[PDB]
């Protein structure tokens, strides 16, 4: 798969969670390889199981299967109670799809890049990308979080590869995330 970019997206993120921290060069590289390489593993099982559908379209439930599927528990609950928060504030509203769904991740940008894992049959459905977006905000916050966390408790207030170590090293189920996305 082609790595796209999603560096504008996680400042955005990173704004929300540790407003007074930014990021080296090097970190966001790293940050930017892991929403990639997750996207890559959740759309490629996304897109397996929606053979299995009449319309064989990618809909979210087909990306919340590969959620449950590629995630550890906690993870899991929590990043597919974020994708259903987020379809739903998207149904519920009226007015940039991003914005309807209440997200900093580019809604537009990951609906072509589903279809772009997409098969020759293949369609992706209305909200499958404002769910996939939710996912990735949600995943995108939670190592921005500890790593961010890591840098307060060392007194500087950017985050380098080093944060990126300890947050993820130091936290179970990221730890085991990363290690299985790193075998495919």
């Given at each position: 798969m082609r790595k796209e970019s999603y560096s504008i997206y996680v400042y955005k993120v990173l704004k929300q969670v540790h407003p007074d921290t930014g990021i080296s060069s090097k970190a966001m590289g790293i940050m930017n390889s892991f929403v990639n390489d997750i996207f890559e593993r959740i759309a490629g099982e996304a897109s397996r199981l929606?053979?299995?559908?009449?319309?064989s379209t990618i809909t979210s439930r087909e990306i919340q299967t590969a959620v449950r599927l590629l995630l550890p528990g906690e993870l899991a609950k929590h990043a597919v109670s974020e994708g259903t928060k987020a379809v739903t504030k998207y149904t519920s509203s009226k007015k940039s799809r991003s914005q309807r769904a209440g997200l900093q991740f580019p809604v537009g940008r990951i609906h072509r890049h589903l279809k772009s894992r997409t098969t020759s049959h293949g369609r992706v459905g209305a909200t499958a990308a404002v769910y996939s977006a939710a996912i990735l905000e949600y995943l995108t916050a939670e190592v921005l979080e500890l790593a961010g966390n890591a840098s307060k408790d060392l007194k500087v207030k950017r985050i380098t590869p080093r944060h990126l170590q300890l947050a993820i090293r130091g936290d179970e189920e990221l730890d085991s995330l990363i290690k299985a996305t790193i075998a495919g």
């Open positions: 929606a053979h299995y559908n009449k319309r």
